[PDB]
Design a protein around this ligand. Structure first.
Ligand SMILES: Nc1nc2c(ncn2[C@@H]2O[C@H](COP(=O)(O)OP(=O)(O)OP(=O)(O)O)[C@@H](O)[C@H]2O)c(=O)[nH]1
Ligand SMILES: Nc1nc2c(ncn2[C@@H]2O[C@H](COP(=O)(O)OP(=O)(O)OP(=O)(O)O)[C@@H](O)[C@H]2O)c(=O)[nH]1
Ligand SMILES: Nc1nc2c(ncn2[C@@H]2O[C@H](COP(=O)(O)OP(=O)(O)O)[C@@H](O)[C@H]2O)c(=O)[nH]1
Ligand SMILES: Nc1nc2c(ncn2[C@@H]2O[C@H](COP(=O)(O)OP(=O)(O)O)[C@@H](O)[C@H]2O)c(=O)[nH]1
Ligand SMILES: [Mg+2]
Ligand SMILES: [Mg+2]
Ligand SMILES: [Mg+2]
Lengths: 427, 53, 430, 430, 427
């Protein structure tokens, strides 16, 4: 009877949750009209983690979709499985943050924060036991990063004993989508360390690559990319919604994966990724779900895990599986390559099994990895930020909404501080 | 209670892919068996680009 | 609801605007009388039952370019008070459009902009269309832009202006009229998109295989660039680009705000069948200087910030691979302090084709608006043209006698001389 | 995928390419308009909705021969930009095609090459077609070939050129343009395959028994060699021979890359019924000097490498028995340091017969392309014709005035003289 | 439970190895679809030696299919029984070696050797305990010669204790399918001495001679020649996949037939060969099999057995038979002509019996001999190598890819060294 409240911001956040709540819905067997027509009794046992029961069998999520433009919700208005949401929980803006981190945070940010936090507070008091708050947003943008990161700092003030899952996408190293991309990213990670308790790192270039070499797709849309992200988000809370032989909730991963409070940036992975051409030939047994779990190609982050040591890792298995085959495969990966794991921590791997697989798959598993290789991602964004700030280019906008260069120097100071302690632990 | 939907409604975007019509990743994420009328396409080709040989 | 107001000033403004609003009524299905047989709110204002009014005004002191709109095929479209005429033109004189006859009509110009702004619910920016060659587009545009920053602060103002070509120009006091305009469009207009008539003459020559281009053919694909610029508001796509998103991505410094323009697919009705139009082909076509819409060579300067707005069947992956192939080329050289030069926007609406037009129906199109240090070649050449003619006081008594003094030539020259210093200083590698 | 760009330079390259692509469109079933009513990707690009365009450019300075293609039956097959023309021809001047008038078009030629190279995912070679008799085929051919080496390094450039015959020559300054082409075609084409008009005249006279052949009859069986070499890329077989396999098996040295050509079953329609076409019989036919497509006798020289390419109903057994009888023949001489001489390739596609052509429908075909020391007689005869004309400076004022200098005629003379010594050196027994 | 990883290299290896997977799947009862339809219980008892279990009862080969051109992969998959292979196991490039040993071993093999090691590892640790690796390629081309022997050198360093059986076709004395055989053959064999542990030498024009005078097939294609080679490949591991009266796996043939570590080149033969009109006149008795097995015309290499003495031989008889007839006709074939056998090795032959005969034949045997007359096929390559190398013809393609002329002379010395160790054993 523990609960998770879902909050989302920006273009990137809303499009993920359009697919994320879609993927959750047919796992639980509820129609886009909201009625339940599932064939399994185990689906209705833990619904309250993600849905409010309503009159007539309607189920409405704990979804609070935040944006500063009506464009994102318009896609949610008309997209598939977009009618399940609460109309009152669509807080909206009119001006738009305009891809500016200063506009979403300080000046135009304050006019909507008092309204979006009212929607959060109404849902927080309605459910009894709050496991934590889950946010999905971007970092290089300004609407979901600028307004989102202030919202995370505020909600840690009101609820300091509750965990914080953030699924924030990251500026790609190879390619770029916006021009103020390193500016809005370094200001957000500077705030994400202080407020958030655990972070899942995503980026489109790894989601693009994982759709090519592992899925054999040469035309991946964003809706194809959002599905693989949505499979990861269902895998974290698969223990809450379904039973298992060994149970690991959200707070159990927090004590496992976080040795020190600032080292909460993880990398994700989803195991049964089979192309349709090679779908029949592969078998589904625990040793071959593990061999795709630890592959560097299966990681949905920029960082190559072969570069840096694994400080702590977690695995969220789903399915009817032997407990030895879960145990022995994750024990073999501690002996075959022990140079990639940290010596001064014994048994870096957290494992948990849930007996209810996803729809159709006989077995599945989700990987969360606290690697020190994530410093390669943070170094590159800090490299771009120092290049543009020393010329003070694109800075006359951010100083226009009420910023001075003091926190810009502070953002690089904390960025250089957090990457310094990763490389100190790698030695 | 909702107003009129803004920003139009584009028809058939993103397009159904050639070399079998794929508008979703449900087949891969649900592990559905391949149909006999579509198995020959993946018998002939490796990627989703169609009939190279 | 989002909305953008377009003001059409000078002879170039209306003739673009006739081509601009022709492209707009075919996208929304609105007939020329104004009747559509939910996204028109960006440009059209719904009134009564089945009537749509363009949110634009035609402001020109010469009545003989506006009256053909008032009697053409678009009589029932425009509001008759939006069409603002005058007794006599400014006669390519900056002093007449700014001091003598400009002030007598700009009061009526603000009277309808306030009417257009009050009818608007959510405003994101302004569009201005003018030519700095003629004093109506140059002087009255300078007067209206200076007044609008006082009247409507901190709002976006998109500058679609036309500059004299190096080898081609159809007026004599164009070096005089362009330099005085640059005192206003520097400090007031926030985004300025240069256009150049001879570069579009060359674009229509090879890509559209038209041996004898006219002013109608040039303005038709001028309408294509602006419609591609604001198609993100009207239709849905993978990556939307809003007006204020467009302004903070390409303006690194408040004075370095002039940007280029490039529309990649210009294909004929007979070459469309033989070209395999993909997102890799059009993206490489946009960065070609042949497709550049201003007579400047980008190889001399440095690209500094670029946006690529895609229309049609553009899937998000290979466009992200198309940008990577542009970055690997040594010819397209970026500035050192900007490792992230690209902005991307994808809309799902293929570009409409006007019946009887010259462009062919394409399923993919990209419009690039890029900030570069090669635009200093545009200003420095017009600086040399002004400095040679001013040295013997040519055509000064026309300008001075209509209210001006000699001191405004020195201030405008010094202001433009700072731009050439600013472009060299910013683009220098450290 | 496998792809290849075929460039055609000069007037003689056009009617060769006019006769190639009429056989290529028939062999893949492409209709003349350009619509098929997976194997076409080597030479045709899939364009939009069921349309194919040839991966080729038809560049020639004289606008007469290219405009014949524009108004011909293949007006819809070719992209209109690929048919590149010019204002005036080089007019039997290697000076004009390489220095004065060739520069204005070679930039436009390389631009479309970059467009075709970008479209193809894997480029295996460039097929260059020319004749060294004319200015455009030699001057513009050398300028494009030098540029293509720098821009696309380490890529195979397959040279298919026509040298002047010992007896029949249709021009006077053909000795001059042949020697100047030899300095450039030596160091740029990785592999060159000679053709001579005299031997093709004799082939049509003896084998096809047509008394008065024209260039149309010549180029049709030239194209039958062209398809037979690229037969492996488009249709499967037991022993594939790619373009990159073709080079590394036939040239023992970089400066010896001139090779002969042959075609076995050149039989008319009435004589095809009586002849029994076996693998053994046509292999003996291909090694005869009558079947040699270049007017030299192989008996004077020594074969250093041979590459037989087979099409149709050919088993891999009897091709080894046929080669064994060829090796045991005493009039066919192989060089002593190359015991392993033959490169054997068997495609399963029988040759296609063009309607109206003199060639008959045959089940089996052999195209033998072999390097030999008998090609040293070609360069000596063209040298003796050049040495006599240059002895007292005939036809030099045309070349000197149009850019060339006097001293570099001796440089091409010494380069051809070194080619004479190198063929004598490589054939000397050790 | 002893398994073999199969590797196929080049156009020759893919075409031969495709024919190998019908002759072993038919005797294991696998349909072209991939399911099981055999009527015998003994077939499924040992199927892990070559096949991997898949979902739905499917069986997939453990074959990594490797080349540099996409044409042969499309041709192999399009044929019958070509749909049983995994698309992931089709590892290939795009350029093509083009019969160039330097392009295969050094230039264009380097970008693909990382991809082929990734999948031959994935077929190695997936299975239980490796008996060895089996590769089939050519020594005349460049795709299976250069980039094939590069894989053998890499896989011998990674797995040093496993067995290595290579089936390589060698250039002909009489005819020549390419022009650069002895450059490709001398460089490949020199890498093949130290790396590989066994080498079953094949020649195409010994196969044509077999198919002409004995089989009386007047039009033999490559489908004929690969079928004779594939029968020998099924004969070596016949006692692995099926029970036997006297047991002999792949390593049993190693220690019995390799006297000295560089003395490991063998030549093959298949005994029950008779023309189609002459099948009735042959009585399938054990002495009938032995007279064809030891005959010169039946042997599948170009070397003539009467020219040199037999260091060691092996006969792998298949079928229901009496084991003393497996004994005396191997004794009597030594006593009748002892001049053709080595005196200082007594009992130069090894015998084995597998009680499951191949399909359609009730009595069969595959002959593995180690004759010192195999120096003849090596020295005819060596005399062609010295002819071309002394004039340096066809060398600029090889030295244009980073290969100096020093290692050409190094490979020449080992070829003259390997014909030196053979020559001193026939005295
Ligand atoms: N592209 C384009 N340019 C135009 C068009 N009409 C005029 N121009 C440009 O405008 C310049 C002339 O100055 P204008 O601003 O048009 O003069 P005006 O607007 O009549 O100003 P007044 O004469 O004072 O009334 C010429 O050099 C043209 O380049 C047009 O229809 N299309
Ligand atoms: N095989 C063959 N050779 C041709 C043909 N037409 C011309 N030639 C050869 O071309 C040589 C002369 O060059 P041309 O191709 O006629 O003219 P060019 O090379 O384009 O040079 P310009 O006339 O100055 O443009 C002659 O010696 C002919 O041998 C043809 O149709 N077939
Ligand atoms: N996975 C995914 N990422 C997206 C999508 N749309 C935008 N993004 C990412 O969001 C980043 C830009 O941030 P932006 O959307 O402007 O953030 P916003 O200003 O808060 O809306 C880019 O790096 C994109 O990769 C989407 O539909 N799916
Ligand atoms: N047994 C057999 N040998 C073949 C076959 N195809 C080609 N070969 C041999 O392979 C040699 C040519 O090598 P090649 O095919 O180019 O090898 P690659 O470079 O690895 O592709 C020739 O001498 C043929 O004898 C086949 O189907 N069966
Ligand atoms: Mg517990
Ligand atoms: Mg006027
Ligand atoms: Mg000509």
């Amino acid at each position: 009877m523990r609960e998770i409240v879902h909050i989302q911001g920006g273009q990137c956040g809303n499009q993920i949750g359009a697919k994320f709540w879609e993927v959750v819905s047919d796992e639980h067997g509820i129609d886009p009209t909201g009625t339940y027509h599932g064939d399994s009794d185990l689906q209705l046992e833990r619904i309250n983690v993600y849905f409010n029961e309503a009159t007539g069998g309607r189920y409405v999520p704990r979804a609070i979709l935040m944006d500063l433009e009506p464009g994102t919700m318009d896609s949610v208005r008309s997209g598939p499985y977009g009618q399940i949401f609460r109309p009152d929980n669509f807080v909206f803006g009119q001006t738009g943050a305009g891809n500016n981190w200063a506009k979403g945070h300080y000046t135009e940010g304050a006019e909507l924060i008092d309204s979006v936090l009212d929607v959060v507070r109404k849902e927080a008091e309605s459910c009894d036991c709050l496991q934590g708050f889950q946010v999905c947003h971007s970092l290089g943008g300004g609407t979901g990063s600028g307004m989102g990161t202030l919202l995370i700092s505020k909600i840690r003030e009101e609820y300091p004993d509750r965990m914080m899952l953030t699924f924030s996408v990251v500026p790609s190293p190879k390619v770029s989508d916006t021009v103020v991309e390193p500016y809005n990213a370094t200001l957000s990670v500077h705030q994400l360390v202080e407020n958030a308790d655990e972070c899942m790192v995503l980026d489109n270039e790894a989601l693009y690559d994982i759709c090519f070499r592992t899925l054999k797709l040469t035309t991946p849309t964003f809706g194809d990319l959002n599905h693989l992200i949505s499979a990861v988000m269902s895998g974290i809370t698969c223990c809450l919604r379904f039973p298992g032989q060994l149970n690991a909730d959200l707070r159990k991963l927090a004590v496992n994966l976080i040795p020190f409070p600032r080292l909460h940036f993880f990398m994700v992975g989803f195991t049964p990724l089979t192309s349709r051409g090679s779908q029949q030939y592969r078998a589904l047994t625990v040793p071959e779900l593990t061999q795709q779990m630890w592959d560097a190609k299966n990681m949905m982050c920029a960082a190559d895990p072969r570069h840096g040591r694994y400080l702590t890792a977690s695995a969220l298995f789903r399915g009817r599986m032997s407990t030895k085959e879960v145990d022995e495969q994750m024990l073999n990966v501690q002996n075959k390559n022990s140079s990639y794991f940290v010596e001064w921590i014994p048994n870096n791997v957290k494992s948990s099994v849930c007996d209810i697989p996803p729809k159709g798959l006989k077995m599945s598993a989700t990987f969360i990895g606290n690697s020190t290789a994530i410093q390669e991602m943070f170094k590159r964004v800090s490299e771009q930020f120092t290049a543009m700030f020393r010329r003070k280019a694109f800075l006359h906008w951010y100083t226009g909404e009420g910023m001075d260069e003091m926190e810009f120097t502070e953002a690089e100071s904390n960025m250089n501080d957090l990457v310094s302690e990763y490389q100190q632990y790698q030695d | 209670d909702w107003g009129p939907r803004t920003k139009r409604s584009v028809p058939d975007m993103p397009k159904p892919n050639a070399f079998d019509g794929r508008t979703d990743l449900y087949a891969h994420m649900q592990y559905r068996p391949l149909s006999n009328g579509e198995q020959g396409k993946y018998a002939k080709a490796f990627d989703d680009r169609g009939t190279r040989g | 609801m989002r909305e953008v107001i377009s003001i059409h000033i000078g002879q170039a403004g209306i003739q673009v605007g006739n081509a601009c609003w022709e492209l707009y009524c075919l996208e929304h299905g609105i007939q020329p009388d104004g009747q559509m047989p939910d996204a028109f709110n960006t440009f059209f204002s719904e009134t009564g039952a089945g009537k749509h009014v363009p949110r634009c005004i035609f402001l020109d002191l010469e009545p003989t370019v506006v009256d053909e709109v008032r009697t053409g095929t678009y009589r029932q479209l425009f509001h008759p008070e939006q069409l603002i005429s005058g007794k006599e033109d400014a006669a390519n004189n900056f002093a007449r459009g700014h001091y003598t006859i400009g002030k007598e009509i700009v009061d009526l110009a603000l009277d309808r902009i306030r009417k257009l702004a009050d009818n608007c619910t959510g405003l994101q920016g302004f569009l201005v269309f003018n030519a700095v060659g003629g004093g109506t587009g140059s002087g009255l545009g300078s007067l209206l832009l200076e007044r609008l920053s006082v009247d409507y602060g901190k709002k976006s103002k998109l500058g679609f202006t036309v500059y004299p070509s190096p080898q081609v120009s159809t007026a004599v006091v164009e070096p005089y009229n362009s330099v005085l305009s640059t005192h206003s469009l520097l400090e007031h207009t926030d985004v300025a998109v240069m256009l150049d008539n001879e570069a579009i003459y060359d674009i229509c020559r090879r890509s559209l295989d038209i041996e004898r281009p006219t002013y109608t053919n040039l303005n038709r694909l001028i309408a294509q660039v602006i419609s591609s610029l604001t198609a993100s508001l009207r239709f849905d796509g993978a990556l939307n680009v809003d007006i204020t998103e467009f302004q903070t991505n390409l303006v690194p410094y408040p004075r370095i705000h002039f940007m280029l323009s490039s529309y990649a697919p210009i294909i004929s009705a007979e070459k469309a069948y033989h070209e395999q139009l993909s997102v890799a082909e059009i993206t490489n076509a946009a960065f070609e200087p042949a497709s550049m819409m201003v007579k400047c060579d980008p190889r001399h300067g440095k690209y500094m910030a670029c946006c690529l707005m895609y229309r049609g069947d553009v899937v998000p992956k290979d466009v992200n691979a198309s940008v990577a192939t542009i970055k690997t080329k040594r010819t397209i050289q970026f500035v050192d302090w900007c490792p992230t030069g690209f902005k991307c926007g994808i809309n799902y609406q293929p570009p409409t084709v006007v019946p009887g037009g010259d462009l062919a129906k394409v399923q993919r199109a990209v419009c690039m608006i890029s900030n570069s240090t090669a635009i200093g070649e545009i200003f420095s050449r017009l600086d040399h043209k002004f400095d040679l003619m001013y040295a013997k006081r040519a055509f000064v008594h026309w300008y001075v006698g209509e209210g001006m003094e000699e001191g405004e030539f020195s201030e405008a020259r010094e202001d433009l001389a700072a731009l050439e210093k600013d472009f060299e200083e910013v683009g220098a590698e450290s």
